[PDB]
Amino acid sequence: LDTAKAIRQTIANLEPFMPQGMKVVYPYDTTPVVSASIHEVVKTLGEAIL
Amino acid sequence: DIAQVQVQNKLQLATPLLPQEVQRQGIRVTKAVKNFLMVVGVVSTDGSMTKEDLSNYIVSNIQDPLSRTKGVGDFQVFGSQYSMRIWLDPAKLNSYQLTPGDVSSAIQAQNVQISSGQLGGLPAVKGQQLNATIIGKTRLQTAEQFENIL
Amino acid sequence: MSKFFIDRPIFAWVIALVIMLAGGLSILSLPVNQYPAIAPPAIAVQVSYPGASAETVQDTVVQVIEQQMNGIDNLRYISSESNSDGSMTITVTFEQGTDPDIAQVQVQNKLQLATPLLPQEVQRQGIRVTKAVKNFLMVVGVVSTDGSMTKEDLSNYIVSNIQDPLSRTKGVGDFQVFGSQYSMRIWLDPAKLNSYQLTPGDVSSAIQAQNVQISSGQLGGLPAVKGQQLNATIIGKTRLQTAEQFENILLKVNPDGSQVRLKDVADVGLGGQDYSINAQFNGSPASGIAIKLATGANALDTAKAIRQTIANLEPFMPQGMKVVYPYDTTPVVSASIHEVVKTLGEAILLVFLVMYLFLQNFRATLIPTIAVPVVLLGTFGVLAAFGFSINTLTMFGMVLAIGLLVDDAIVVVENVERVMAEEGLSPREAARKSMGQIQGALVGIAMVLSAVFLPMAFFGGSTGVIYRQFSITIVSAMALSVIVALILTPALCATMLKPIEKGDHGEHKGGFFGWFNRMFLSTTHGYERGVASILKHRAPYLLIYVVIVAGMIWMFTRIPTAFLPDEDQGVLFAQVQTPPGSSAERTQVVVDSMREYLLEKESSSVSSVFTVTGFNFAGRGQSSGMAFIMLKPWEERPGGENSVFELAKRAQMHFFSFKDAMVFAFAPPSVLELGNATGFDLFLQDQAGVGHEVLLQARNKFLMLAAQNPALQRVRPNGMSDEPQYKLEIDDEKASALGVSLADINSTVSIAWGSSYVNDFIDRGRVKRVYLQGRPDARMNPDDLSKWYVRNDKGEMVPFNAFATGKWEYGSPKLERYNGVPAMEILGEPAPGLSSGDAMAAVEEIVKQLPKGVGYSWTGLSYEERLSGSQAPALYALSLLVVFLCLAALYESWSIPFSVMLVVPLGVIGALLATSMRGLSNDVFFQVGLLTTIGLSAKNAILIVEFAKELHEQGKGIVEAAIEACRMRLRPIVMTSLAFILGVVPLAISTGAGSGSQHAIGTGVIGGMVTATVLAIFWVPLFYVAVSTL
Amino acid sequence: GASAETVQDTVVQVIEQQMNGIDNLRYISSESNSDGSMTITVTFEQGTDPDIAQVQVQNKLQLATPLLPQEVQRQGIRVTKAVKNFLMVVGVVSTDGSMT
Amino acid sequence: KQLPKGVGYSWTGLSYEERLSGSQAPALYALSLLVVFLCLAALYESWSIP
């Protein structure tokens, strides 16, 4: 998660100098499951404590 | 970190026994995981840039920076950076009795970046007032400059 | 716990006994050095590509190494310079904390991988990688009193005789000789070479031929023939050694039989390898070493050991060779250990006095004298555990601790002493009784104080390392001080104090003591009354409290903020930059019209000058010069007029008359390792290959724009400016049409002008380098090349003027890059009264007028302050929230904690007042001093509240509880403040080595101590009653 | 091709300069042979982390290396931990004498 | 001792280890008497027993 956020950040510090007909995209990408994973348990944490 | 140091510690015992064309190509030792974490692609908006134009972009401006973004173990660019490619024609080549090793050679005598010293050079004679850099031969950059190689 | 050790004085003594052993066995396994590692650890990758130009070095060496520098742990950023002298540096930068030895190795490894991608010529040179922190222990210098030896000579010596042993000298870490070994020098004559139709390249291939140790196998190797019986290695010939042997390596023989020896075409003599840099001691030829302290070493012991080792070498040193120690950080380190053991000693002496004067009994006077030293020994052990060292910061952090150490003792003893007096209880009984009273409070205050000093520690960066020292050593002592105030001291009180006749306050003793007790007895009665007065007419006072506050804030928004005090190190720098194009010979004088000047007109303050041609702080080149103006010990040059900061002003003005060479004076930074302490630091960067020239439009627009911006000042680009460079055009059309190759021309221009490092000979043992290039008068001016010919198809020498042509253009004398792309650094600073933050603000807007494809990023201290700056809110608020919660626990109340927190301002006003009133700045010492002063203050408040709450709960109304509380607390407070102020006075008015730090610390606690003492003794009871009334 | 005396004047001696000053150094012992071989053995106090003393070793040598003969710099100095004792030998013997 | 003044000596390996072991021994005995002394002089609240 850190190294992924670090990357979104290195590129975003580069987009402004990118040419015109050009956008940065994210084909494959493993982090989202992870965010979804715990975020989804945090979700269940609250349901149970309730 | 100890691993990497140990491999490379041994790796640099082979290195010299390796063929030059391989040493010259730059070897990479990395300490990273097996899975790709991700990939960052680039695509043309006004559809004006080829597969190859996007690749020269990545390796030429982004790749290093990611190379050094805390935590990137290793990377793979599905593409390449530009290169001054010289496509040899064996017919024209026969015409003047030339060989690739002739053109590989001219390129090494004519597309160079020599140390040339300077006027005010040290050590200098007593009295010398002027000093400037002497820029001799430089590297080409444009097809045109290579096209015109003697 | 405390009632446990009152009955166990021996056990209690055993604890103290191992605190003392641990601390003593620790004070001598402990490293001793000026500062911890403040700078972010950096690694320097270096090489000189002889005869090279900034562009060849950058594109042939630096870029390729940068392209494979990655996959490296804790890398903050990378930065490099390619120079006109063929040298370069690539400094990688990691987080503070990065393991240096590991960071290094990660960088040389990937260097290793890149080395085969480099020109064969740089590969041969080496490319040294090394740890680049600027924390030099001392710096010697082998200077020739006369003129017998040159810079090159002196060097080879230091590395032939002075080096190897110095490395075996205990404590010595890294060191750099100002120079390399001897290099066999061959200066080819274009004329004496054209006359035999010979070319430099004939010499190189030749030199190589007649100078190569041949393996030569064995005389009986394996397999062997049946028998032999005798096997012996066969040792062939060895490589050349003497200048003569080199003058012999024949090149060709004339048909008439006559032969041509190398001597027949050029000179031959041992010499320097690289002449780029020149250096003289007060004007005499010189070299030297720059040493660092080995990990864990003793700054003091090594200095002795260096001077030791050197001495045993001075006898045999040639006539004229004088060793010398221009710069040494030992005097400041030593004059800091004393200037602490002295204050520590005085403190315990002063405490005795105040302890007597008031308590009038020697026994009670012994206790504080036991505990304070116990605790001070402990702390060292505790630092040892933590891995800290005995440095400038850890020590002063001890000085600051003293108020708090002396305090814990005094409160414990004064309060037993008092209980015995009021209730006629006995030592034992009183001792239990006191500790029943306080005790929680002290655990309470140990917590609250940790919550006031710990958050600092959590700062990232450089300001984080400094603060972490003060923080960890202050709170270690504090925590120890409390432990000992709970185990030992109460035990010592029960054991060592005699009883007092209940109600006896000695107002009868007559004489001085007789007078004093009546005086103080009345003074107290006065105070309870004032306090009682205030507790009647409150609002008006709460009112005035609001004005104490508002004044604090306002007083904050007016005090000059700084990183660290303006220390007078015995040194001052002087940067010399002559006009672009200037020859070293020119610059050499521009730096002498200074030396002669400094060394003489300023003899009152100047001892010797160390000057250099070729090197500078903006760049390198013949137009780049500098002088390292030493100074004699602080002692032998008092009075502001002879301050490094005053010497400057003079030095400057003189140099002012210099419409021919930019000259500047400036005292070095407070902590060298960091350099630029005040201002901002950033790189302008081409993040789109826009190009040098474009990029340079940026740095010039940036500059002449930011200077229309009334938020910045002194904005100077850091690197160099393009000068004129003599380009060479080669018409190959006439080259191939003249029978002259093209590779032979290049080899000609390289191996004759730029120089060529060809072979490795053998010099008096070790191996050194053979250098081949044209004799001086053959490579000075554009016509000099016309002097050089090359053989053709046959053997017709073709002069360089028959196909080559000249042409002057503009080029970079110094190329820089930051994170892989070309870049340009700009310094400067904030406008008077404005903060570095504001300054970055203006800049964050300027940058927006940039050309397309140019970006920027902060570096160095601006990179850092931008990170620490952002956590402060969080830290400041955790500090408040835990002090709150701990006082809530102590008093069993959500509101009463407010009646001691509201003393913060009370004391911080007198600090702002005293410091501003003395012209000092809001720096490190002031800030940590302000936490110390407010810690003690709040301890005074806490106890008062605590007592009152007790009185209050044992059946007395709020205002009556507050009056009694303050009356009971006054003697304690007056004693610790009376004694703590006087302890610091000597720092407040000190002079000499390190006096600048001692002031930044004395001026702050005195002010904070005075106002805080006198004001909290009046407003806390107000606060306490004011909030209980709500 | 060089004598034990060369191996020492142009190699070992130089590498030893860099080895002085290393953390937790007990002693260093080197040997120069007449077959072009050498060994510098650098010894450290117990408790010293050996992975890290090697790295300090590599870091120091890298500064001697350029001052070595180019016949070595192209070669490659070997750096390894130093165990004084063999644990065992695993030999191989031919019975019918089929293999020498 | 019968060596040409110019040639000294210096122990190593096994020996080195020996000359150290000797060195330790004293303080080892001193400090060890101390710990036993203090621990008794605290566990029995007296100086007489220790």
Ligand SMILES: CCCCCCCCCCCCO[C@@H]1O[C@H](CO)[C@@H](O[C@H]2O[C@H](CO)[C@@H](O)[C@H](O)[C@H]2O)[C@H](O)[C@H]1O
């Ligand atoms: C109080 C401030 C005192 C400042 C003193 C500064 C004086 C320094 C003078 C240095 C003079 C030059 O000394 C310089 O030494 C460096 C090594 O460190 C040499 O470095 C040279 O050999 C080394 C290998 O040994 C190569 O890796 C390098 O590529 C090559 O340039 C230079 O060839 C030599 O010119």
Ligand SMILES: CCCCCCCCCCCCO[C@@H]1O[C@H](CO)[C@@H](O[C@H]2O[C@H](CO)[C@@H](O)[C@H](O)[C@H]2O)[C@H](O)[C@H]1O
């Ligand atoms: C994760 C752990 C973090 C812990 C942080 C909590 C910090 C706690 C600070 C120490 C406070 C100890 O406070 C302890 O208890 C109570 C207060 O409620 C007090 O006991 C009190 O009781 C009586 C009547 O109630 C009063 O006469 C008098 O004020 C005092 O004797 C003592 O002053 C102290 O012995």
Ligand SMILES: CCCCCCCCCCCCO[C@@H]1O[C@H](CO)[C@@H](O[C@H]2O[C@H](CO)[C@@H](O)[C@H](O)[C@H]2O)[C@H](O)[C@H]1O
């Ligand atoms: C009884 C003993 C009690 C005394 C000990 C108290 C210690 C003080 C605790 C502070 C240490 C916490 O460490 C600190 O955490 C905060 C909060 O996450 C961080 O702060 C981080 O998150 C916060 C909240 O989003 C941001 O506003 C902040 O700018 C960001 O840096 C700090 O950068 C970090 O340095």
Ligand SMILES: CCCCCCCCCCCCO[C@@H]1O[C@H](CO)[C@@H](O[C@H]2O[C@H](CO)[C@@H](O)[C@H](O)[C@H]2O)[C@H](O)[C@H]1O
């Ligand atoms: C018996 C007595 C005991 C007394 C001893 C108490 C020891 C307490 C020391 C705490 C040391 C904290 O360690 C320090 O944490 C800070 C803040 O998180 C780090 O700083 C880092 O943290 C935060 C992350 O949230 C970032 O915002 C910040 O930019 C980053 O650099 C330091 O790089 C680290 O060195």
